[PDB]
mmCIF file of all heavy atoms in Angstrom:
data_model
loop_
_atom_site.group_PDB
_atom_site.id
_atom_site.type_symbol
_atom_site.label_atom_id
_atom_site.label_comp_id
_atom_site.label_asym_id
_atom_site.label_seq_id
_atom_site.Cartn_x
_atom_site.Cartn_y
_atom_site.Cartn_z
ATOM 1 N N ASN A 1 6.934 -0.219 -25.301
ATOM 2 C CA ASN A 1 7.183 -1.443 -26.057
ATOM 3 C C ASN A 1 6.653 -2.619 -25.237
ATOM 4 O O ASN A 1 6.638 -2.564 -24.007
ATOM 5 C CB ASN A 1 8.668 -1.636 -26.342
ATOM 6 C CG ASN A 1 9.405 -2.221 -25.177
ATOM 7 O OD1 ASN A 1 9.773 -1.509 -24.248
ATOM 8 N ND2 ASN A 1 9.613 -3.533 -25.207
ATOM 9 N N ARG A 2 6.215 -3.677 -25.917
ATOM 10 C CA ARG A 2 5.659 -4.847 -25.237
ATOM 11 C C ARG A 2 6.516 -5.324 -24.067
ATOM 12 O O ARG A 2 6.043 -5.399 -22.931
ATOM 13 C CB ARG A 2 5.457 -5.987 -26.235
ATOM 14 N N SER A 3 7.776 -5.640 -24.351
ATOM 15 C CA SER A 3 8.690 -6.122 -23.326
ATOM 16 C C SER A 3 8.561 -5.319 -22.036
ATOM 17 O O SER A 3 8.369 -5.892 -20.965
ATOM 18 C CB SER A 3 10.124 -6.060 -23.845
ATOM 19 O OG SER A 3 10.999 -6.745 -22.973
ATOM 20 N N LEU A 4 8.658 -3.994 -22.143
ATOM 21 C CA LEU A 4 8.544 -3.108 -20.983
ATOM 22 C C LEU A 4 7.131 -3.097 -20.428
ATOM 23 O O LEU A 4 6.932 -2.953 -19.224
ATOM 24 C CB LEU A 4 8.953 -1.670 -21.341
ATOM 25 C CG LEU A 4 8.494 -0.551 -20.384
ATOM 26 C CD1 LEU A 4 9.520 0.561 -20.357
ATOM 27 C CD2 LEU A 4 7.132 -0.002 -20.804
ATOM 28 N N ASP A 5 6.144 -3.226 -21.302
ATOM 29 C CA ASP A 5 4.778 -3.227 -20.833
ATOM 30 C C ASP A 5 4.460 -4.533 -20.117
ATOM 31 O O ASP A 5 3.493 -4.602 -19.366
ATOM 32 C CB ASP A 5 3.817 -2.983 -21.994
ATOM 33 C CG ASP A 5 3.795 -1.526 -22.425
ATOM 34 O OD1 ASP A 5 4.407 -0.691 -21.719
ATOM 35 O OD2 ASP A 5 3.166 -1.207 -23.459
ATOM 36 N N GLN A 6 5.277 -5.564 -20.334
ATOM 37 C CA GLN A 6 5.057 -6.842 -19.667
ATOM 38 C C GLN A 6 5.550 -6.740 -18.237
ATOM 39 O O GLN A 6 4.862 -7.136 -17.299
ATOM 40 C CB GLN A 6 5.817 -7.964 -20.360
ATOM 41 C CG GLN A 6 5.286 -8.354 -21.718
ATOM 42 C CD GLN A 6 5.952 -9.617 -22.258
ATOM 43 O OE1 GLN A 6 7.168 -9.803 -22.112
ATOM 44 N NE2 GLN A 6 5.159 -10.487 -22.892
ATOM 45 N N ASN A 7 6.759 -6.215 -18.081
ATOM 46 C CA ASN A 7 7.345 -6.050 -16.765
ATOM 47 C C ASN A 7 6.569 -5.064 -15.921
ATOM 48 O O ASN A 7 6.558 -5.154 -14.701
ATOM 49 C CB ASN A 7 8.797 -5.605 -16.877
ATOM 50 C CG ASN A 7 9.732 -6.765 -17.147
ATOM 51 O OD1 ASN A 7 9.698 -7.376 -18.222
ATOM 52 N ND2 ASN A 7 10.563 -7.094 -16.155
ATOM 53 N N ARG A 8 5.924 -4.106 -16.562
ATOM 54 C CA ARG A 8 5.136 -3.149 -15.804
ATOM 55 C C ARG A 8 3.924 -3.888 -15.223
ATOM 56 O O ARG A 8 3.611 -3.762 -14.037
ATOM 57 C CB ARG A 8 4.652 -1.995 -16.697
ATOM 58 C CG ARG A 8 5.702 -0.966 -17.115
ATOM 59 C CD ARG A 8 4.984 0.283 -17.633
ATOM 60 N NE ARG A 8 3.998 -0.035 -18.673
ATOM 61 C CZ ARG A 8 3.047 0.796 -19.103
ATOM 62 N NH1 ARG A 8 2.933 2.008 -18.583
ATOM 63 N NH2 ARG A 8 2.210 0.412 -20.060
ATOM 64 N N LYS A 9 3.258 -4.667 -16.072
ATOM 65 C CA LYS A 9 2.077 -5.414 -15.666
ATOM 66 C C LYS A 9 2.432 -6.530 -14.689
ATOM 67 O O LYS A 9 1.684 -6.788 -13.747
ATOM 68 C CB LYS A 9 1.361 -5.998 -16.894
ATOM 69 C CG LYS A 9 -0.010 -6.579 -16.578
ATOM 70 C CD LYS A 9 -0.746 -7.080 -17.810
ATOM 71 C CE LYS A 9 -2.131 -7.600 -17.427
ATOM 72 N NZ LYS A 9 -2.923 -8.096 -18.586
ATOM 73 N N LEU A 10 3.565 -7.192 -14.909
ATOM 74 C CA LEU A 10 3.978 -8.273 -14.016
ATOM 75 C C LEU A 10 4.114 -7.739 -12.594
ATOM 76 O O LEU A 10 3.415 -8.167 -11.677
ATOM 77 C CB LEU A 10 5.320 -8.872 -14.454
ATOM 78 C CG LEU A 10 5.940 -9.848 -13.442
ATOM 79 C CD1 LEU A 10 5.169 -11.154 -13.437
ATOM 80 C CD2 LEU A 10 7.398 -10.095 -13.785
ATOM 81 N N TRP A 11 5.018 -6.786 -12.421
ATOM 82 C CA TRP A 11 5.257 -6.201 -11.120
ATOM 83 C C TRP A 11 4.025 -5.564 -10.507
ATOM 84 O O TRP A 11 3.928 -5.461 -9.288
ATOM 85 C CB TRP A 11 6.398 -5.190 -11.215
ATOM 86 C CG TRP A 11 7.694 -5.869 -11.457
ATOM 87 C CD1 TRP A 11 8.437 -5.848 -12.597
ATOM 88 C CD2 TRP A 11 8.371 -6.742 -10.551
ATOM 89 N NE1 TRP A 11 9.539 -6.659 -12.461
ATOM 90 C CE2 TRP A 11 9.520 -7.219 -11.212
ATOM 91 C CE3 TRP A 11 8.113 -7.173 -9.244
ATOM 92 C CZ2 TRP A 11 10.413 -8.104 -10.608
ATOM 93 C CZ3 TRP A 11 8.998 -8.051 -8.648
ATOM 94 C CH2 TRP A 11 10.137 -8.508 -9.330
ATOM 95 N N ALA A 12 3.074 -5.150 -11.333
ATOM 96 C CA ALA A 12 1.875 -4.524 -10.795
ATOM 97 C C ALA A 12 1.039 -5.557 -10.074
ATOM 98 O O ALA A 12 0.588 -5.314 -8.964
ATOM 99 C CB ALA A 12 1.066 -3.868 -11.905
ATOM 100 N N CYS A 13 0.840 -6.709 -10.710
ATOM 101 C CA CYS A 13 0.053 -7.796 -10.128
ATOM 102 C C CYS A 13 0.741 -8.365 -8.909
ATOM 103 O O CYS A 13 0.094 -8.648 -7.908
ATOM 104 C CB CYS A 13 -0.151 -8.923 -11.135
ATOM 105 S SG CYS A 13 -1.197 -8.490 -12.539
ATOM 106 N N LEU A 14 2.051 -8.549 -9.000
ATOM 107 C CA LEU A 14 2.807 -9.078 -7.878
ATOM 108 C C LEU A 14 2.644 -8.153 -6.666
ATOM 109 O O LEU A 14 2.540 -8.618 -5.525
ATOM 110 C CB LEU A 14 4.287 -9.221 -8.252
ATOM 111 C CG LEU A 14 4.628 -10.283 -9.304
ATOM 112 C CD1 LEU A 14 6.130 -10.236 -9.647
ATOM 113 C CD2 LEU A 14 4.240 -11.661 -8.781
ATOM 114 N N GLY A 15 2.605 -6.847 -6.925
ATOM 115 C CA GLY A 15 2.448 -5.874 -5.859
ATOM 116 C C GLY A 15 1.102 -6.012 -5.185
ATOM 117 O O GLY A 15 1.010 -5.908 -3.973
ATOM 118 N N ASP A 16 0.066 -6.258 -5.984
ATOM 119 C CA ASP A 16 -1.308 -6.426 -5.501
ATOM 120 C C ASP A 16 -1.442 -7.678 -4.659
ATOM 121 O O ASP A 16 -2.017 -7.640 -3.568
ATOM 122 C CB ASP A 16 -2.277 -6.523 -6.679
ATOM 123 C CG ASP A 16 -2.433 -5.212 -7.408
ATOM 124 O OD1 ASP A 16 -2.634 -4.174 -6.733
ATOM 125 O OD2 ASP A 16 -2.356 -5.218 -8.655
ATOM 126 N N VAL A 17 -0.923 -8.784 -5.195
ATOM 127 C CA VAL A 17 -0.938 -10.083 -4.529
ATOM 128 C C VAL A 17 -0.115 -9.961 -3.255
ATOM 129 O O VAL A 17 -0.492 -10.446 -2.189
ATOM 130 C CB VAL A 17 -0.323 -11.157 -5.437
ATOM 131 C CG1 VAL A 17 -0.067 -12.427 -4.659
ATOM 132 C CG2 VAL A 17 -1.255 -11.434 -6.582
ATOM 133 N N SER A 18 1.013 -9.284 -3.379
ATOM 134 C CA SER A 18 1.892 -9.080 -2.251
ATOM 135 C C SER A 18 1.141 -8.478 -1.081
ATOM 136 O O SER A 18 1.056 -9.073 -0.011
ATOM 137 C CB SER A 18 3.025 -8.145 -2.654
ATOM 138 O OG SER A 18 3.878 -7.910 -1.557
ATOM 139 N N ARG A 19 0.600 -7.289 -1.321
ATOM 140 C CA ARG A 19 -0.145 -6.510 -0.338
ATOM 141 C C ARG A 19 -1.445 -7.118 0.123
ATOM 142 O O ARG A 19 -1.880 -6.840 1.232
ATOM 143 C CB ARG A 19 -0.478 -5.116 -0.880
ATOM 144 C CG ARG A 19 0.685 -4.142 -0.996
ATOM 145 C CD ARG A 19 0.160 -2.761 -1.369
ATOM 146 N NE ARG A 19 -0.529 -2.800 -2.656
ATOM 147 C CZ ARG A 19 0.084 -2.701 -3.835
ATOM 148 N NH1 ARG A 19 1.409 -2.544 -3.897
ATOM 149 N NH2 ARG A 19 -0.624 -2.799 -4.954
ATOM 150 N N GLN A 20 -2.067 -7.943 -0.714
ATOM 151 C CA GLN A 20 -3.368 -8.521 -0.367
ATOM 152 C C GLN A 20 -3.444 -9.976 0.098
ATOM 153 O O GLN A 20 -4.319 -10.324 0.900
ATOM 154 C CB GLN A 20 -4.335 -8.328 -1.540
ATOM 155 C CG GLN A 20 -4.480 -6.891 -1.970
ATOM 156 C CD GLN A 20 -5.432 -6.737 -3.121
ATOM 157 O OE1 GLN A 20 -6.565 -7.216 -3.064
ATOM 158 N NE2 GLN A 20 -4.985 -6.065 -4.180
ATOM 159 N N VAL A 21 -2.553 -10.831 -0.396
ATOM 160 C CA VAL A 21 -2.611 -12.229 0.000
ATOM 161 C C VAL A 21 -1.568 -12.608 1.039
ATOM 162 O O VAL A 21 -0.372 -12.368 0.863
ATOM 163 C CB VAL A 21 -2.484 -13.186 -1.221
ATOM 164 C CG1 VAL A 21 -2.719 -14.616 -0.777
ATOM 165 C CG2 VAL A 21 -3.505 -12.828 -2.283
ATOM 166 N N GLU A 22 -2.050 -13.189 2.135
ATOM 167 C CA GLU A 22 -1.193 -13.650 3.212
ATOM 168 C C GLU A 22 -0.842 -15.095 2.862
ATOM 169 O O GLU A 22 -1.711 -15.889 2.479
ATOM 170 C CB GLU A 22 -1.939 -13.603 4.539
ATOM 171 C CG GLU A 22 -1.039 -13.692 5.750
ATOM 172 C CD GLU A 22 -1.822 -13.723 7.044
ATOM 173 O OE1 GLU A 22 -3.060 -13.927 6.981
ATOM 174 O OE2 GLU A 22 -1.196 -13.548 8.115
ATOM 175 N N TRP A 23 0.432 -15.438 2.979
ATOM 176 C CA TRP A 23 0.857 -16.782 2.647
ATOM 177 C C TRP A 23 1.317 -17.545 3.877
ATOM 178 O O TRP A 23 2.426 -17.343 4.374
ATOM 179 C CB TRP A 23 1.990 -16.737 1.609
ATOM 180 C CG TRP A 23 2.148 -18.012 0.822
ATOM 181 C CD1 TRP A 23 3.302 -18.682 0.581
ATOM 182 C CD2 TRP A 23 1.116 -18.737 0.151
ATOM 183 N NE1 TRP A 23 3.062 -19.780 -0.197
ATOM 184 C CE2 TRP A 23 1.724 -19.838 -0.476
ATOM 185 C CE3 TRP A 23 -0.266 -18.560 0.020
ATOM 186 C CZ2 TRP A 23 1.001 -20.765 -1.227
ATOM 187 C CZ3 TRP A 23 -0.988 -19.480 -0.726
ATOM 188 C CH2 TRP A 23 -0.351 -20.570 -1.341
ATOM 189 N N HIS A 24 0.452 -18.416 4.375
ATOM 190 C CA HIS A 24 0.809 -19.230 5.522
ATOM 191 C C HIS A 24 1.406 -18.429 6.683
ATOM 192 O O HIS A 24 2.510 -18.732 7.154
ATOM 193 C CB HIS A 24 1.790 -20.322 5.070
ATOM 194 C CG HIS A 24 1.221 -21.244 4.032
ATOM 195 N ND1 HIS A 24 0.713 -22.487 4.337
ATOM 196 C CD2 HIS A 24 1.013 -21.073 2.704
ATOM 197 C CE1 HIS A 24 0.215 -23.040 3.244
ATOM 198 N NE2 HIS A 24 0.384 -22.202 2.240
ATOM 199 N N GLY A 25 0.678 -17.405 7.132
ATOM 200 C CA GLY A 25 1.134 -16.609 8.261
ATOM 201 C C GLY A 25 2.191 -15.565 7.982
ATOM 202 O O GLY A 25 2.644 -14.860 8.890
ATOM 203 N N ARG A 26 2.593 -15.456 6.723
ATOM 204 C CA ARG A 26 3.600 -14.480 6.337
ATOM 205 C C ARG A 26 3.106 -13.574 5.224
ATOM 206 O O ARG A 26 2.145 -13.883 4.526
ATOM 207 C CB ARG A 26 4.858 -15.183 5.839
ATOM 208 C CG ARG A 26 5.590 -16.047 6.844
ATOM 209 C CD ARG A 26 6.924 -16.438 6.259
ATOM 210 N NE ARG A 26 7.545 -15.258 5.661
ATOM 211 C CZ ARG A 26 8.693 -15.266 4.989
ATOM 212 N NH1 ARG A 26 9.358 -16.410 4.830
ATOM 213 N NH2 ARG A 26 9.175 -14.130 4.480
ATOM 214 N N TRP A 27 3.767 -12.441 5.063
ATOM 215 C CA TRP A 27 3.424 -11.531 3.985
ATOM 216 C C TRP A 27 4.674 -11.465 3.123
ATOM 217 O O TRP A 27 5.720 -11.016 3.589
ATOM 218 C CB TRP A 27 3.070 -10.141 4.524
ATOM 219 C CG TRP A 27 1.747 -10.096 5.243
ATOM 220 C CD1 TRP A 27 1.534 -10.196 6.594
ATOM 221 C CD2 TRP A 27 0.448 -10.002 4.638
ATOM 222 N NE1 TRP A 27 0.185 -10.173 6.863
ATOM 223 C CE2 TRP A 27 -0.506 -10.055 5.684
ATOM 224 C CE3 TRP A 27 -0.003 -9.880 3.316
ATOM 225 C CZ2 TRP A 27 -1.885 -9.992 5.445
ATOM 226 C CZ3 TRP A 27 -1.375 -9.816 3.084
ATOM 227 C CH2 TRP A 27 -2.297 -9.872 4.144
ATOM 228 N N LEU A 28 4.589 -11.942 1.886
ATOM 229 C CA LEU A 28 5.753 -11.927 1.007
ATOM 230 C C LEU A 28 5.770 -10.663 0.169
ATOM 231 O O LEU A 28 4.717 -10.141 -0.170
ATOM 232 C CB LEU A 28 5.730 -13.145 0.086
ATOM 233 C CG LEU A 28 6.044 -14.532 0.652
ATOM 234 C CD1 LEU A 28 5.401 -14.717 1.987
ATOM 235 C CD2 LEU A 28 5.546 -15.580 -0.326
ATOM 236 N N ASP A 29 6.952 -10.154 -0.159
ATOM 237 C CA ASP A 29 7.016 -8.961 -0.993
ATOM 238 C C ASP A 29 6.881 -9.437 -2.442
ATOM 239 O O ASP A 29 6.821 -10.638 -2.691
ATOM 240 C CB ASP A 29 8.336 -8.227 -0.793
ATOM 241 C CG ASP A 29 9.520 -9.045 -1.226
ATOM 242 O OD1 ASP A 29 9.345 -10.251 -1.481
ATOM 243 O OD2 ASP A 29 10.629 -8.484 -1.313
ATOM 244 N N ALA A 30 6.845 -8.509 -3.394
ATOM 245 C CA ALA A 30 6.678 -8.874 -4.804
ATOM 246 C C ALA A 30 7.708 -9.838 -5.340
ATOM 247 O O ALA A 30 7.365 -10.712 -6.122
ATOM 248 C CB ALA A 30 6.658 -7.632 -5.667
ATOM 249 N N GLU A 31 8.965 -9.673 -4.931
ATOM 250 C CA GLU A 31 10.051 -10.546 -5.387
ATOM 251 C C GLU A 31 9.889 -11.985 -4.899
ATOM 252 O O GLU A 31 10.153 -12.944 -5.640
ATOM 253 C CB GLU A 31 11.398 -9.998 -4.921
ATOM 254 C CG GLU A 31 11.816 -8.738 -5.642
ATOM 255 C CD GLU A 31 13.184 -8.230 -5.204
ATOM 256 O OE1 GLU A 31 14.169 -8.998 -5.320
ATOM 257 O OE2 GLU A 31 13.277 -7.059 -4.754
ATOM 258 N N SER A 32 9.465 -12.131 -3.644
ATOM 259 C CA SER A 32 9.239 -13.442 -3.063
ATOM 260 C C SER A 32 8.135 -14.122 -3.835
ATOM 261 O O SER A 32 8.294 -15.264 -4.236
ATOM 262 C CB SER A 32 8.837 -13.324 -1.596
ATOM 263 O OG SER A 32 9.945 -12.938 -0.808
ATOM 264 N N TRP A 33 7.020 -13.420 -4.041
ATOM 265 C CA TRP A 33 5.888 -13.966 -4.790
ATOM 266 C C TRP A 33 6.276 -14.351 -6.222
ATOM 267 O O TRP A 33 5.716 -15.299 -6.789
ATOM 268 C CB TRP A 33 4.720 -12.973 -4.830
ATOM 269 C CG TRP A 33 3.751 -13.112 -3.690
ATOM 270 C CD1 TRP A 33 3.533 -12.214 -2.680
ATOM 271 C CD2 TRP A 33 2.866 -14.214 -3.444
ATOM 272 N NE1 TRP A 33 2.566 -12.686 -1.819
ATOM 273 C CE2 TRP A 33 2.137 -13.910 -2.262
ATOM 274 C CE3 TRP A 33 2.614 -15.429 -4.104
ATOM 275 C CZ2 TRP A 33 1.168 -14.780 -1.727
ATOM 276 C CZ3 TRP A 33 1.647 -16.299 -3.571
ATOM 277 C CH2 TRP A 33 0.936 -15.964 -2.395
ATOM 278 N N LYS A 34 7.229 -13.617 -6.802
ATOM 279 C CA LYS A 34 7.694 -13.904 -8.157
ATOM 280 C C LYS A 34 8.329 -15.295 -8.154
ATOM 281 O O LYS A 34 8.059 -16.123 -9.031
ATOM 282 C CB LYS A 34 8.712 -12.852 -8.621
ATOM 283 C CG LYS A 34 8.893 -12.831 -10.137
ATOM 284 C CD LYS A 34 9.737 -11.659 -10.605
ATOM 285 C CE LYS A 34 11.229 -11.880 -10.356
ATOM 286 N NZ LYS A 34 11.889 -12.778 -11.366
ATOM 287 N N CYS A 35 9.158 -15.542 -7.142
ATOM 288 C CA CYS A 35 9.838 -16.830 -6.967
ATOM 289 C C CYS A 35 8.829 -17.987 -6.781
ATOM 290 O O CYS A 35 9.010 -19.071 -7.333
ATOM 291 C CB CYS A 35 10.789 -16.753 -5.757
ATOM 292 S SG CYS A 35 12.284 -17.764 -5.895
ATOM 293 N N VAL A 36 7.769 -17.746 -6.007
ATOM 294 C CA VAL A 36 6.735 -18.750 -5.753
ATOM 295 C C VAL A 36 5.931 -19.071 -7.016
ATOM 296 O O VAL A 36 5.500 -20.212 -7.206
ATOM 297 C CB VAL A 36 5.750 -18.274 -4.641
ATOM 298 C CG1 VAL A 36 4.525 -19.192 -4.575
ATOM 299 C CG2 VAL A 36 6.467 -18.249 -3.302
ATOM 300 N N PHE A 37 5.741 -18.063 -7.873
ATOM 301 C CA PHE A 37 4.973 -18.221 -9.102
ATOM 302 C C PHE A 37 5.742 -18.861 -10.240
ATOM 303 O O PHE A 37 5.244 -19.769 -10.900
ATOM 304 C CB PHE A 37 4.418 -16.869 -9.557
ATOM 305 C CG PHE A 37 3.157 -16.444 -8.827
ATOM 306 C CD1 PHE A 37 3.134 -15.280 -8.060
ATOM 307 C CD2 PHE A 37 2.005 -17.214 -8.899
ATOM 308 C CE1 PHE A 37 1.979 -14.890 -7.373
ATOM 309 C CE2 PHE A 37 0.847 -16.830 -8.216
ATOM 310 C CZ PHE A 37 0.837 -15.663 -7.448
ATOM 311 N N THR A 38 6.955 -18.392 -10.483
ATOM 312 C CA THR A 38 7.722 -18.974 -11.566
ATOM 313 C C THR A 38 7.957 -20.424 -11.211
ATOM 314 O O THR A 38 8.014 -21.285 -12.078
ATOM 315 C CB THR A 38 9.068 -18.268 -11.762
ATOM 316 O OG1 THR A 38 9.934 -18.585 -10.676
ATOM 317 C CG2 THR A 38 8.880 -16.770 -11.790
ATOM 318 N N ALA A 39 8.058 -20.698 -9.919
ATOM 319 C CA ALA A 39 8.302 -22.058 -9.451
ATOM 320 C C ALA A 39 7.112 -22.990 -9.660
ATOM 321 O O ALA A 39 7.260 -24.201 -9.651
ATOM 322 C CB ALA A 39 8.701 -22.039 -7.979
ATOM 323 N N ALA A 40 5.924 -22.429 -9.834
ATOM 324 C CA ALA A 40 4.763 -23.269 -10.065
ATOM 325 C C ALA A 40 4.865 -23.712 -11.515
ATOM 326 O O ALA A 40 4.242 -24.686 -11.924
ATOM 327 C CB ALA A 40 3.477 -22.480 -9.845
ATOM 328 N N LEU A 41 5.677 -22.996 -12.282
ATOM 329 C CA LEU A 41 5.828 -23.295 -13.694
ATOM 330 C C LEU A 41 7.138 -23.981 -14.044
ATOM 331 O O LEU A 41 7.252 -24.604 -15.092
ATOM 332 C CB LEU A 41 5.667 -22.007 -14.505
ATOM 333 C CG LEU A 41 4.340 -21.305 -14.208
ATOM 334 C CD1 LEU A 41 4.289 -19.956 -14.866
ATOM 335 C CD2 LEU A 41 3.208 -22.168 -14.685
ATOM 336 N N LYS A 42 8.132 -23.871 -13.177
ATOM 337 C CA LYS A 42 9.403 -24.517 -13.448
ATOM 338 C C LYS A 42 10.222 -24.696 -12.185
ATOM 339 O O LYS A 42 10.479 -23.749 -11.425
ATOM 340 C CB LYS A 42 10.217 -23.736 -14.493
ATOM 341 C CG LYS A 42 11.584 -24.361 -14.769
ATOM 342 C CD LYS A 42 12.261 -23.777 -16.010
ATOM 343 C CE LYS A 42 13.586 -24.516 -16.325
ATOM 344 N NZ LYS A 42 14.304 -24.054 -17.571
ATOM 345 N N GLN A 43 10.629 -25.938 -11.968
ATOM 346 C CA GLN A 43 11.415 -26.274 -10.799
ATOM 347 C C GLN A 43 12.662 -25.446 -10.699
ATOM 348 O O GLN A 43 13.212 -25.000 -11.709
ATOM 349 C CB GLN A 43 11.787 -27.745 -10.809
ATOM 350 C CG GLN A 43 12.130 -28.295 -12.164
ATOM 351 C CD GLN A 43 12.494 -29.741 -12.054
ATOM 352 O OE1 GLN A 43 13.620 -30.079 -11.679
ATOM 353 N NE2 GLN A 43 11.533 -30.618 -12.340
ATOM 354 N N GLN A 44 13.095 -25.257 -9.458
ATOM 355 C CA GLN A 44 14.269 -24.476 -9.125
ATOM 356 C C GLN A 44 15.505 -25.344 -9.242
ATOM 357 O O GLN A 44 15.421 -26.557 -9.225
ATOM 358 C CB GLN A 44 14.123 -23.940 -7.689
ATOM 359 C CG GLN A 44 12.884 -23.058 -7.488
ATOM 360 C CD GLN A 44 12.636 -22.666 -6.036
ATOM 361 O OE1 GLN A 44 12.189 -23.483 -5.225
ATOM 362 N NE2 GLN A 44 12.923 -21.410 -5.705
ATOM 363 N N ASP A 45 16.655 -24.721 -9.373
ATOM 364 C CA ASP A 45 17.885 -25.473 -9.455
ATOM 365 C C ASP A 45 18.564 -25.503 -8.110
ATOM 366 O O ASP A 45 18.255 -24.698 -7.247
ATOM 367 C CB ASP A 45 18.815 -24.839 -10.465
ATOM 368 C CG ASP A 45 18.574 -25.353 -11.834
ATOM 369 O OD1 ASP A 45 17.423 -25.231 -12.302
ATOM 370 O OD2 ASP A 45 19.529 -25.890 -12.434
ATOM 371 N N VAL A 46 19.493 -26.432 -7.931
ATOM 372 C CA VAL A 46 20.210 -26.524 -6.676
ATOM 373 C C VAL A 46 21.691 -26.766 -6.934
ATOM 374 O O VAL A 46 22.060 -27.740 -7.596
ATOM 375 C CB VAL A 46 19.638 -27.663 -5.774
ATOM 376 C CG1 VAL A 46 20.514 -27.866 -4.550
ATOM 377 C CG2 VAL A 46 18.235 -27.310 -5.320
ATOM 378 N N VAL A 47 22.522 -25.853 -6.427
ATOM 379 C CA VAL A 47 23.978 -25.938 -6.535
ATOM 380 C C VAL A 47 24.520 -25.873 -5.100
ATOM 381 O O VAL A 47 23.828 -25.419 -4.186
ATOM 382 C CB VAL A 47 24.576 -24.759 -7.352
ATOM 383 C CG1 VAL A 47 23.962 -24.703 -8.736
ATOM 384 C CG2 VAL A 47 24.341 -23.464 -6.633
ATOM 385 N N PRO A 48 25.763 -26.333 -4.880
ATOM 386 C CA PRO A 48 26.354 -26.310 -3.535
ATOM 387 C C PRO A 48 26.533 -24.895 -3.007
ATOM 388 O O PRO A 48 26.721 -23.951 -3.779
ATOM 389 C CB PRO A 48 27.691 -27.006 -3.736
ATOM 390 C CG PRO A 48 27.446 -27.890 -4.943
ATOM 391 C CD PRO A 48 26.664 -26.998 -5.837
#
């Protein structure tokens, strides 16, 4: 189903970027990169 095929493709690219792109001296895993990307599209929230 599309929904599942989206998450499959999402995580696939994140894995590639993860393994291939170095970010300012660090190597981020797929989850970290997900946070960096969604954030380019929408600001993060801040609670105490």
Side-chain angles (χ1 to χ4, degrees), residues 1 3-48:
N1 81 279
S3 191
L4 162 148
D5 284 352
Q6 290 189 320
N7 279 68
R8 286 196 308 166
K9 190 177 182 179
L10 170 73
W11 290 110
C13 292
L14 292 176
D16 290 312
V17 168
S18 179
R19 288 188 299 276
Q20 304 180 52
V21 187
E22 196 183 13
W23 202 228
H24 299 261
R26 297 191 45 184
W27 289 96
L28 287 41
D29 64 349
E31 289 182 58
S32 288
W33 270 113
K34 198 171 77 79
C35 212
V36 169
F37 279 118
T38 71
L41 305 172
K42 178 167 185 177
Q43 38 179 280
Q44 301 173 286
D45 272 57
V46 172
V47 303

